[PDB]
Symmetry: C3
Subunit: 355 residues, 3 copies
């Protein structure tokens, strides 16, 4: 399956005792069907209590979502330190190339972050970390410069420098203004709610950073035994990450003479990532065991809307009656009208195992 | 020839007794010389009298031009039906991913549409139709979902659903607000007219949709035995479609040590498509049999102008006299000035067979 | 080395006795590590005294910098000739597809121009000249059209035309409004100056043309025995051209399991071009023989800033003291604070051979 990435697909970028940094591979190298979002990367960050991450920068724009825990982030912006507290449900952006670090000063809860990267390198989809604080593990960018250059740059003998750039081996994650603020997404829950679930969205019109990358961030909850009404985005491509719970998906894909839609089926568990290309109708079904929590990013979100194939607000009811009659061509009269009004909910519906 | 596509190059996407949908292949797969417009696709639609097209959507932005007939289009926009009458010469846009249908309620005239698509899929140049009304021919996207999902989605037993999503086999085309309005292009004819022809243009400053895709649409008529003055676009790439009549083209292409311009020659007949890359000078010559009618789309139209190589307004007359003298280097004095003023027309001239 | 281009890499596009046109190859064909700037091309122009360049146009946007000499440029804009004097240090832009020519009317000094091109063709990175004045050397675009077309276009017999389009063999360069004005960059020198060097920048907010291509142009001078403080751009990619003098560079590149930064070393001499991808820290060291003069273009310049790794304004001093302490992990207390304040200069420092 080119569209569904289970947690075992994540490659480790940094592994220590105090934390982990995982990243899904370049989308463009997995399939040709995903080449149009090859510029975007998905990463996860886990930081144990009482930890700090090494100051570094990446050659990529960075949208983060805090899935669990609390702490703070600090990045460098024009000889000033921008410091912001992070909390569960926070969405925040770090400009590309800006030296940053994260701190988890909680005594019992891990800090967990899910992120979308947008590369700004000369290679599409490729990003690299540049550590500016460090030691042997990992090495810093200072390790690439000759001794004469470094001695001249810092105006100190190399021995004092080697003593400074070689005393850290505890890894990337280790045990101890007027710039934008984090926006708590998982807070608000205004956007849609019925008896079966809810979701919340933050877009370009809510935050200057999301606007600069044309991304909408969403967080949804499906109650046990419920399903999203089959629906599609008009122009946005979605990257979804399962936060909690379990379930499955069904997606229709005409790419996988006559017109034919293939069935994309997959299981959903914690850490599962799936990609919904623009126009592809999908339904997410939640298990009866527990609720389904899903975070998602909409790429190319400007002007995007969602059209529903079933439910109280489906597109079929919006078509003229005659056309609907002709297109399905039924002798029975308005049997179609009876069927179209059987579903009393919209957007989020009762599932198969709870009809 | 990588630049000229005769009507036999069009592949059939849908063929029935009441209508046809044809599409030229991906430009990027024909030649490397066209990779920069690989995102754009050319389609044609013919609908017999008293016909309706199945409601569906495509993962692409859609600029249509009505070449012949009248009828109407309807697309779905936020639980509202946007319905607009279409007439010969109308230009209209349908947003990507929006469910639409076309109707030809005329009793004697076919509805014929020529279109430029701009893909919004994850694959550049590839677009697919998603039928939401239908049956076995064609199948709908509903056919990809399991029975339990569908039964739950619609809240009806599958037997009533199969009876609804299986009674249509007559094909894609069959016998029976405050949103934008179609703009009639073939109407106005203000833009240029002399004794030999005329043309009309609609661009980003005339219509919000054309502005969002940066396209100018043009319609031109060449009288029998006339030619366009050899000329080039500064930055726009043109995709031209022959509406009526016959003729030929000559184009200079340096791609096909020393500087050398190859001669791109081709015959023009009804349904011929040709591509003029930016900077490539071209002349269109009309046969003596009849007039030449041409529709065209300018890609990357913002800031684009046309420079003429011959005729009353050519670039050579704008150069300083001395430079013009030096560059051609002639002993005869101002023989160049005599030659440059021999042509009394501009833009559209008398052809070879009527000098 | 994929990042460093010595003068022998330039291919000759036009060679005569009165001048030369050189161009570096497509960046995208040299390495995959440069694919993201494959749309940009670097060219050099030398014109002897009392020379004129043949009127032509290219399918590319053109930013020029005059490295040496004086003269003027003229391009065609809507039946008007835009004529502008050029002087050493001038930056000017020519819109793509606009017929232009250059003149060197100086009696003793050559006119030398260094340029960044941004292609507007259907092939990324490829540009071609279209000569409209000419002869056998080079041929014009008129040479691609048939005799009947040309005779009809100009309304003159072909013999008079062949006598006009065949009398020039002296090559591309030969011996004799309210539109934008050239902006002298090498003039101002406000932007930064200390005891070791200076630099000057012109960006999108200073000039409408630079804004349309999102490029900043810079000119810097390093005194003998000095170095730039190791630093990186946040998001811009730089293309640098050595104007005068000699020296070397050291660049850290993580592309060339564990995190590892490779050392990119190269020699700098006149005509050396080097590319600094976004995020890559670099230092330029000037020889003790003479000063180092460098011209550079910043691609994707909007929102870009520079962060310094050493010197009075380095990023390490901006980090919180504790984090800096933890990250380098030193028993010695604030030995880091002593080392960080040893360098009293910023941006441009004393080199290795003059500590
Ligand atoms: Cu698909
Ligand atoms: Cu060509
Ligand atoms: Cu690198």
């Amino acid at each position: 399956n080119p569209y569904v990435f289970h947690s075992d697909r994540f490659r480790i970028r940094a592994s220590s005792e105090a934390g982990e940094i995982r990243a899904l591979p370049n989308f463009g190298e997995v399939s040709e069907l995903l080449e149009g979002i090859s510029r975007y990367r998905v990463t996860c960050i886990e930081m144990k209590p009482n930890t700090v991450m090494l100051p570094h920068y990446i050659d990529a724009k960075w949208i983060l979502y805090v899935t669990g825990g609390r702490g703070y982030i600090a990045y460098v912006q024009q000889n000033e330190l921008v410091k912001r507290k992070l909390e569960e449900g926070d969405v925040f952006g770090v400009p590309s190339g800006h030296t940053f670090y994260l701190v988890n000063n909680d005594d019992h809860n891990s800090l967990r972050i899910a992120s979308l990267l947008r590369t700004e390198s000369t290679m599409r989809g490729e990003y690299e970390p540049f550590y500016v604080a460090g030691g042997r593990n990992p090495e810093t960018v200072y390790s690439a410069f000759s001794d004469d250059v470094l001695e001249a740059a810092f105006n100190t003998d190399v021995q004092k420098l080697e003593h400074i750039f070689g005393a850290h081996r505890r890894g990337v994650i280790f045990y101890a203004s007027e710039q934008p603020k984090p926006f708590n997404l998982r807070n608000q829950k205004p956007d849609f709610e019925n008896d079966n679930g809810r979701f919340t969205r933050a877009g370009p019109k809510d935050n200057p950073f999301l606007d600069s990358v044309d991304v909408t961030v969403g967080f949804g909850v499906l109650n046990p035994g419920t399903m999203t009404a089959p629906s599609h985005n008009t122009k946005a491509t979605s990257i979804a990450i399962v936060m909690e719970g379990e379930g499955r998906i069904e997606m229709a894909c005409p790419h996988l003479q006559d017109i034919n839609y293939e069935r994309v089926r997959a299981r959903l568990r914690t850490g599962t990532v799936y990609v919904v290309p623009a126009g592809h109708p999908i339904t997410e079904i939640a298990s009866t065991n527990g609720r389904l929590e899903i975070l998602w990013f909409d790429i190319n979100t400007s002007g995007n809307e969602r059209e529903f194939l079933a439910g109280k607000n489906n597109v079929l009811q919006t078509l003229e009656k005659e056309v609907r009659h002709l297109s399905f061509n039924i002798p029975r009269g308005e049997e179609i009208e009876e069927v179209l009004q059987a579903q009393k909910d919209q957007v989020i519906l009762r599932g198969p195992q709870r009809q």
